[PDB]
Amino acid sequence: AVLKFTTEIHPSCVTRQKVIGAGEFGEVYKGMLKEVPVAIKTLKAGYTEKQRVDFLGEAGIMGQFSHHNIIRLEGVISKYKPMMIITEYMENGALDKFLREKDGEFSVLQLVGMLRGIAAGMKYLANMNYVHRDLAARNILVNSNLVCKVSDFGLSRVLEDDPEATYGKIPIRWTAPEAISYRKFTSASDVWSFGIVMWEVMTYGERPYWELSNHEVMKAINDGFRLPTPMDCPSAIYQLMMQCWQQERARRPKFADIVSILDKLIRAPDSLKTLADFDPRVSIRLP
Numbered sequence: 001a002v003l004k005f006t007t008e009i010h011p012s013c014v015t016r017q018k019v020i021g022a023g024e025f026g027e028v029y030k031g032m033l034k035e036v037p038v039a040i041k042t043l044k045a046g047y048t049e050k051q052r053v054d055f056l057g058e059a060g061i062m063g064q065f066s067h068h069n070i071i072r073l074e075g076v077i078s079k080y081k082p083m084m085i086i087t088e089y090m091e092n093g094a095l096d097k098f099l100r101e102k103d104g105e106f107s108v109l110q111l112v113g114m115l116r117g118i119a120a121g122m123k124y125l126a127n128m129n130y131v132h133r134d135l136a137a138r139n140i141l142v143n144s145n146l147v148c149k150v151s152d153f154g155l156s157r158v159l160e161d162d163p164e165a166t167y168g169k170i171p172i173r174w175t176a177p178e179a180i181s182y183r184k185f186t187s188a189s190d191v192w193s194f195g196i197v198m199w200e201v202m203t204y205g206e207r208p209y210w211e212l213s214n215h216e217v218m219k220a221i222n223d224g225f226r227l228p229t230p231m232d233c234p235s236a237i238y239q240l241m242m243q244c245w246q247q248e249r250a251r252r253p254k255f256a257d258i259v260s261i262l263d264k265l266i267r268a269p270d271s272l273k274t275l276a277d278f279d280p281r282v283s284i285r286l287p
């Protein structure tokens with residue numbers, strides 16, 4: 001009854017063409033749907049009851065949503081095996097790898113526009129009573145219009161399948177303190193994560209906290225340290241990400257506030273020309 005919203009697609013409408021993701025229990029393909037490019041995720045024979053519930057539950061959750069910044073479900077193949085979930089095809093893949101492969105290639109306005117799209121998707125999820133728990137640039141997909149869409153939906157499968165999530169099982173350095181310390185995951189802990197995504201975007205995919213271990217990150221945060229300004233970062237953007245990292249959940253902006261601020265900055269783009277000071281790590285001097 002969450003699945004009866006989803007379209008059942010017949011296997012002869014679907015051609016898998018190239019592997020673009022993979023795991024032990026299936027893979028993701030670029031393909032064509034009856035013609036239109038699509039992404040195709042499979043679940044291999046022998047799957048458990050829990051695996052079937054998790055897998056079709058991702059499609060069930062995605063089919064409840066209709067928003068420009070949330071990956072769109074085309075349908076499912078469940079009456080034939082292997083079972084499949086079919087979605088729109090995002091031509092530029094995961095945002096973290098995309099940024100690292102395109103370092104320096106975008107304007108500051110383009111980067112901020114990507115953040116506004118992610119925030120808009122997150123406001124929608126939050127208002128739909130969906131807590132993501134694993135918001136990170138690796139879980140955002142980018143299309144050929146530079147539109148960023150939130151992906152990676154489900155219940156326990158989200159944190160269980162993410163290699164960044166370490167033994168609870170949590171992607172520590174994207175996660176808010178209260179979610180680490182007492183398992184309180186809410187839209188406000190997703191705002192903390194969004195602050196981290198802001199920093200990943202503005203740095204072209206630098207790894208948060210560099211080589212600090214998970215314990216060192218948790219200790220730094222609890223002692224009040226925060227990530228430093230990216231290079232060439234608008235002051236308003238650094239101010240906003242810093243407010244996402246308030247220790248006190250109630251002091252963080254809501255996604256509604258984030259979308260509003262980002263929309264105003266984009267509409268007055270000269271506001272983005274004032275840069276936060278960058279703390280240089282190397283001094284170079286010449287006589």
Ligand SMILES: Cc1cccc(Cl)c1NC(=O)c1cnc(Nc2cccc(C(=O)N3CC[C@H](CC(=O)O)C3)c2)s1
Binds near residue numbers: 028039041085089091
């Ligand atoms: C299918 C599905 C099921 C459940 C949940 C979700 Cl979110 C999805 N949908 C997806 O996973 C995806 C939708 N679009 C995706 N696009 C994607 C992912 C990873 C890499 C790429 C990508 O940029 N390329 C692979 C093909 C191209 C390289 C080549 O053509 O040789 C570049 C695209 S994945």
